Design an enzyme around this catalytic site. Structure first.
Site, PDB file in Angstrom:
ATOM      1  N   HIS A   4      34.914  33.422  35.710  1.00  0.00           N
ATOM      2  CA  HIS A   4      35.131  34.814  36.090  1.00  0.00           C
ATOM      3  C   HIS A   4      34.589  35.522  34.857  1.00  0.00           C
ATOM      4  O   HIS A   4      34.862  35.098  33.732  1.00  0.00           O
ATOM      5  CB  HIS A   4      36.616  35.123  36.262  1.00  0.00           C
ATOM      6  CG  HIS A   4      37.252  34.381  37.391  1.00  0.00           C
ATOM      7  ND1 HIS A   4      37.317  34.883  38.674  1.00  0.00           N
ATOM      8  CD2 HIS A   4      37.816  33.152  37.438  1.00  0.00           C
ATOM      9  CE1 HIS A   4      37.896  33.995  39.461  1.00  0.00           C
ATOM     10  NE2 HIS A   4      38.205  32.937  38.735  1.00  0.00           N
TER      11      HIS A   4
ATOM     12  N   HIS B 284      37.754  28.141  34.760  1.00  0.00           N
ATOM     13  CA  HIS B 284      38.845  27.547  35.521  1.00  0.00           C
ATOM     14  C   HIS B 284      38.464  26.165  36.021  1.00  0.00           C
ATOM     15  O   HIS B 284      37.551  26.023  36.839  1.00  0.00           O
ATOM     16  CB  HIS B 284      39.201  28.423  36.721  1.00  0.00           C
ATOM     17  CG  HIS B 284      39.909  29.689  36.352  1.00  0.00           C
ATOM     18  ND1 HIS B 284      40.017  30.762  37.209  1.00  0.00           N
ATOM     19  CD2 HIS B 284      40.546  30.051  35.214  1.00  0.00           C
ATOM     20  CE1 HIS B 284      40.685  31.733  36.615  1.00  0.00           C
ATOM     21  NE2 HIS B 284      41.016  31.328  35.403  1.00  0.00           N
TER      22      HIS B 284
ATOM     23  N   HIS C 142      34.746  26.760  37.756  1.00  0.00           N
ATOM     24  CA  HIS C 142      33.984  27.985  37.924  1.00  0.00           C
ATOM     25  C   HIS C 142      34.440  28.966  36.858  1.00  0.00           C
ATOM     26  O   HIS C 142      35.362  28.677  36.094  1.00  0.00           O
ATOM     27  CB  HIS C 142      34.241  28.584  39.303  1.00  0.00           C
ATOM     28  CG  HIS C 142      35.675  28.927  39.543  1.00  0.00           C
ATOM     29  ND1 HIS C 142      36.580  28.029  40.070  1.00  0.00           N
ATOM     30  CD2 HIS C 142      36.376  30.054  39.276  1.00  0.00           C
ATOM     31  CE1 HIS C 142      37.775  28.591  40.120  1.00  0.00           C
ATOM     32  NE2 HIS C 142      37.676  29.819  39.645  1.00  0.00           N
TER      33      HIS C 142
ATOM     34  N   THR D 231      43.779  32.989  42.064  1.00  0.00           N
ATOM     35  CA  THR D 231      43.525  34.374  41.685  1.00  0.00           C
ATOM     36  C   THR D 231      42.591  35.098  42.648  1.00  0.00           C
ATOM     37  O   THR D 231      42.227  36.251  42.416  1.00  0.00           O
ATOM     38  CB  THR D 231      42.943  34.460  40.274  1.00  0.00           C
ATOM     39  OG1 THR D 231      41.656  33.837  40.261  1.00  0.00           O
ATOM     40  CG2 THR D 231      43.863  33.775  39.272  1.00  0.00           C
ATOM     41  N   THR D 232      42.198  34.417  43.721  1.00  0.00           N
ATOM     42  CA  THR D 232      41.351  35.023  44.746  1.00  0.00           C
ATOM     43  C   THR D 232      41.981  34.675  46.079  1.00  0.00           C
ATOM     44  O   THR D 232      42.763  33.727  46.171  1.00  0.00           O
ATOM     45  CB  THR D 232      39.914  34.439  44.789  1.00  0.00           C
ATOM     46  OG1 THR D 232      39.948  33.124  45.364  1.00  0.00           O
ATOM     47  CG2 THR D 232      39.310  34.372  43.402  1.00  0.00           C
TER      48      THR D 232
ATOM     49  N   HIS E 286      31.258  34.781  45.351  1.00  0.00           N
ATOM     50  CA  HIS E 286      32.355  35.295  44.530  1.00  0.00           C
ATOM     51  C   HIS E 286      32.229  34.820  43.083  1.00  0.00           C
ATOM     52  O   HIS E 286      32.694  35.483  42.155  1.00  0.00           O
ATOM     53  CB  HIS E 286      33.698  34.845  45.109  1.00  0.00           C
ATOM     54  CG  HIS E 286      33.875  35.205  46.551  1.00  0.00           C
ATOM     55  ND1 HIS E 286      33.949  34.262  47.551  1.00  0.00           N
ATOM     56  CD2 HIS E 286      33.951  36.411  47.163  1.00  0.00           C
ATOM     57  CE1 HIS E 286      34.060  34.870  48.719  1.00  0.00           C
ATOM     58  NE2 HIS E 286      34.064  36.174  48.511  1.00  0.00           N
TER      59      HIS E 286
ATOM     60  N   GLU F 218      40.621  36.815  33.416  1.00  0.00           N
ATOM     61  CA  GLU F 218      41.660  37.163  34.371  1.00  0.00           C
ATOM     62  C   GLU F 218      42.972  37.214  33.604  1.00  0.00           C
ATOM     63  O   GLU F 218      43.682  38.218  33.637  1.00  0.00           O
ATOM     64  CB  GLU F 218      41.681  36.136  35.502  1.00  0.00           C
ATOM     65  CG  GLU F 218      40.359  36.129  36.266  1.00  0.00           C
ATOM     66  CD  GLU F 218      40.507  35.679  37.698  1.00  0.00           C
ATOM     67  OE1 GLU F 218      40.905  34.518  37.916  1.00  0.00           O
ATOM     68  OE2 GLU F 218      40.220  36.491  38.603  1.00  0.00           O
TER      69      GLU F 218
HETATM   70  C1  LIG Z   1      43.029  27.283  50.231  1.00  0.00           C
HETATM   71  C2  LIG Z   1      41.683  26.559  50.327  1.00  0.00           C
HETATM   72  C3  LIG Z   1      40.602  27.454  50.980  1.00  0.00           C
HETATM   73  C4  LIG Z   1      39.122  27.234  50.526  1.00  0.00           C
HETATM   74  C5  LIG Z   1      38.147  28.283  51.179  1.00  0.00           C
HETATM   75  C6  LIG Z   1      36.661  28.246  50.739  1.00  0.00           C
HETATM   76  C7  LIG Z   1      35.790  27.435  51.706  1.00  0.00           C
HETATM   77  C8  LIG Z   1      38.974  27.252  48.961  1.00  0.00           C
HETATM   78  O1  LIG Z   1      38.409  26.309  48.396  1.00  0.00           O
HETATM   79  N1  LIG Z   1      39.423  28.243  48.138  1.00  0.00           N
HETATM   80  C9  LIG Z   1      39.292  28.279  46.649  1.00  0.00           C
HETATM   81  C10 LIG Z   1      40.059  27.227  46.023  1.00  0.00           C
HETATM   82  C11 LIG Z   1      40.426  27.726  44.699  1.00  0.00           C
HETATM   83  C12 LIG Z   1      40.837  27.044  43.580  1.00  0.00           C
HETATM   84  C13 LIG Z   1      41.134  27.761  42.410  1.00  0.00           C
HETATM   85  C14 LIG Z   1      41.004  29.179  42.402  1.00  0.00           C
HETATM   86  S1  LIG Z   1      41.402  30.023  40.884  1.00  0.00           S
HETATM   87  N2  LIG Z   1      40.530  31.318  40.733  1.00  0.00           N
HETATM   88  O2  LIG Z   1      42.766  30.453  40.988  1.00  0.00           O
HETATM   89  O3  LIG Z   1      41.049  29.122  39.815  1.00  0.00           O
HETATM   90  C15 LIG Z   1      40.585  29.885  43.541  1.00  0.00           C
HETATM   91  C16 LIG Z   1      40.286  29.140  44.728  1.00  0.00           C
HETATM   92  C17 LIG Z   1      39.827  29.550  46.080  1.00  0.00           C
HETATM   93 ZN   LIG Z   2      39.193  31.131  39.110  1.00  0.00          ZN
END
Ligand SMILES: CCCC(CCC)C(=O)N[C@@H]1Cc2ccc(S(N)(=O)=O)cc2C1
Ligand SMILES: [Zn+2]
Length: 259
Positions: A95, A118, A93, A197-198, A63, A105
């Site tokens: 986007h 982010h 990371h 956001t994902t 992703h 985003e």
């Molecule tokens: C709820 C935790 C589930 C796990 C699954 C992946 C092994 C995870 O690490 N998810 C990641 C954790 C995380 C942190 C920040 C953001 S963002 N784009 O809003 O900055 C998206 C995600 C999805």
């Molecule tokens: Zn993000």
């Protein structure tokens, strides 16, 4: 098999089926209307202390790519601003888009930047990340916009290792990376309560979006676009446009740290 993504049949407009919270009351990202945002005097000085940050690895998760940090000790932390307590950096990371005119985003007065960084942190009062994502104030994400112009020297080490994690599932050692090299001069920011956001789109995030973007070169972002959504040995699907569009602000107010 049919997992979430950013395509026509598994993209943002489809997420709500497996993750109903996608149509929730505090979803992210959002458009930041600068004229409606209000200066908040109750906000304390923002503190970004990344001097002891210890990176460990970089991973292509299909992703985006994550630069992970060792959060077993109190090192790289974010505090102050709208935050109550200390939040520990766990990973960062980006986007980005397929073109310079899109990729971020969050948007500012509907303006889309080329990319968005982010830096993810979890509230230490909850023990660890897992417990934190079960709380309304469990996470704090520092968002930074990227525009295309002069190169960002501090980003090159990340850019040069992407060739080793081209496909989904690949990771590579990535130690001693200093995230301080990705921060703009000013810490002026906008803040509001939001979500991941994902998927799973959990509503546990206090968003802190910096007003000043960092500049990265066309060459640097072009390399982001060489990554793959697919795994090794599969048809190539360039990792581009891995951003979710602005969501309804609903019952929320965006606060500014500056007058
Ligand atoms: C709820 C935790 C589930 C796990 C699954 C992946 C092994 C995870 O690490 N998810 C990641 C954790 C995380 C942190 C920040 C953001 S963002 N784009 O809003 O900055 C998206 C995600 C999805
Ligand atoms: Zn993000």
């Amino acid at each position: 098999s049919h997992h979430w993504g950013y395509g026509k049949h598994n993209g943002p407009e489809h997420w709500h089926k497996d993750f109903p919270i996608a149509k929730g009351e505090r979803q992210s990202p959002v458009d930041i209307d600068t004229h409606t945002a209000k200066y908040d005097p109750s906000l304390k000085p923002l503190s970004v202390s990344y001097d002891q940050a210890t990176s460990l690895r970089i991973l292509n998760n299909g992703h985006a790519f994550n630069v992970e940090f060792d959060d077993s000790q109190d090192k790289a932390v974010l505090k102050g601003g709208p935050l109550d307590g200390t939040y520990r950096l766990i990973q960062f990371h980006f986007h980005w888009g397929s073109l310079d005119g899109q990729g971020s985003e969050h948007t500012v007065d509907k303006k889309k930047y080329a990319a968005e960084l982010h830096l993810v942190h979890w509230n230490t009062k909850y023990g660890d990340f897992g417990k934190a994502v079960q709380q309304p104030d469990g996470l704090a994400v520092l968002g930074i916009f990227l525009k295309v112009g002069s190169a960002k020297p501090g980003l090159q080490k990340v850019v040069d290792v992407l060739d080793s994690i081209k496909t989904k599932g690949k990771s590579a050692d990535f130690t001693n990376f200093d995230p301080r090299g990705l921060l703009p001069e000013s810490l002026d920011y906008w803040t509001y309560p939001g979500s991941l956001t994902t998927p799973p789109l959990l509503e546990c995030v206090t968003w802190i979006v910096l007003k000043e973007p960092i500049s990265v070169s066309s060459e640097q972002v072009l390399k982001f676009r060489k990554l793959n959504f697919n795994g090794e040995g599969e048809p190539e699907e360039l990792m581009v446009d891995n951003w979710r569009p602005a969501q309804p602000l609903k019952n929320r107010q965006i606060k500014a740290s500056f007058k």
